[PDB]
Amino acid sequence: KPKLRFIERAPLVPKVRREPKNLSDIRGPSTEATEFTEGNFAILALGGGYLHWGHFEMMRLTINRSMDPKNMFAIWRVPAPFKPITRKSVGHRMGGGKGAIDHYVTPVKAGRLVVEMGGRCEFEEVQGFLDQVAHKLPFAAKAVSRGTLEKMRKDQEERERNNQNPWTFERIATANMLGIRKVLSPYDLTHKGKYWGKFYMPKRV
Amino acid sequence: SKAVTRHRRVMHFQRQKLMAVTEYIPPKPAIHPSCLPGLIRLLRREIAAVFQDNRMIAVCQNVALSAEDKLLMRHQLRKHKILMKVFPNQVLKPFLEDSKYQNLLPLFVGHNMLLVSEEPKVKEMVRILRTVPFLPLLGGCIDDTILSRQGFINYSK
Amino acid sequence: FREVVETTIIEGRITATPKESPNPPNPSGQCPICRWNLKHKYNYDDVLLLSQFIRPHGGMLPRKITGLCQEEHRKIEECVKMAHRAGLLPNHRPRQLNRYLTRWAPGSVKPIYKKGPRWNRVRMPVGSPLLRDNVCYSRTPWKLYH
């Protein structure tokens, strides 16, 4: 079935316990699903954000529009909306508990692949509508091949080996050089200064 | 303000000073590096076989025609055993020095088409070319002797 | 160079061809800037260098004729723009406010009616940033925005 299957608004089994918005599901490098698995092309996230249902319909709709099913297949990597984001009632005062469940959401961290592509297709064919899709996403994203992915990771190794700057973030933060863990996160010792909030600094070594 | 926000949150000022001190510095060399220092053999065998084939050769500037007009020229020279050849001069300039044609090195440039032959209908080809007030006869070479267009009048006559 | 002499008769006469000076101090460089140790050591001030790349009606020469680097062709192209506007090339006409270091064309720039707050101030561009990497013999670099 070489198309994007329908992604529902909310799973069949509900989630009756409300959840705290643990926003470290947006922060940082993703661990799950960073590499390709029988794919050739993808929509890599250069930053974290939340996917609604309407984003999933923007991807399924505007990809399955311009797609050759005899030439190209595609797989969701990001699962269905499972995080229950609540909203209190409109124009009501504070307190009184936590608001009722409004709509579900997936968290997507940076470095996550969202939609894998595959088949008898070149990258320059698929740059177009995956760049349109990559611009309709809430976070900054990018259409990435396999050789472009290993290309930019080898680029990041070149940046980390070429810089004539003696002072990196890793040497300052982990050694606590200028007493500077007073200003840094505990996550900045493992993000190594390339993540601020949910964003991602690719240019920053 | 939360740790994850929708806008890029303002850093603390020593956070920002660390970010500026630990910027990426690219390496600078002392000298910029940019300021430092099958079908081809098909044409070689094919046209090199055309070199040994022909006893007489001629050539023109055959770009000045239409498609069905080049079909008419193709049929009226198909009436003879002469052949017409559109091929790049890019490979033909090493072709001439391979075939020891030093008087033919100043000949083959621009738009040109070979008229390789063993039997001269080239006077009657001129009879086809006199009705069209263009497309001149460029000089040939029968058996390592050059033909000017005056020599095409003499030999073709 | 060659000229097109006409009067109706039109002929072409190769007239008075120059040549470059016989000893480049950096042979096996690439650009004629690169051959003469001038990679960062010229500005819009020095017009003996700029005038060699200029059409006699003021325009630039193409990169294939001069054989320049791409970088130095944009640099000379910009310095020639910045030197026509400072009145340093008076004889490169086809047939008054004094300026120098003008990045943009003088009849194209809207005035700054609301210069911003101190943290977002609209500055005035002075000079070109193609000329950043020149040798500054001061300690402060070139301030490109006034």
Binding site: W167, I172, L178 | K17, L18, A20, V21 | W119, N120
Partner: peptide, 28 residues
């Protein structure tokens, strides 16, 4: 909005150098 001058970078850097030599002499 507050931005980082060259004074602040050079000052921060010479504190980093004093720090690196403190790292050296505590290593033996």
């Amino acid at each position: 909005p507050r931005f980082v001058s060259l004074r602040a970078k050079q000052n921060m850097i010479r504190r980093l150098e004093i720090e690196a030599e403190n790292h050296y002499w505590l290593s033996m």
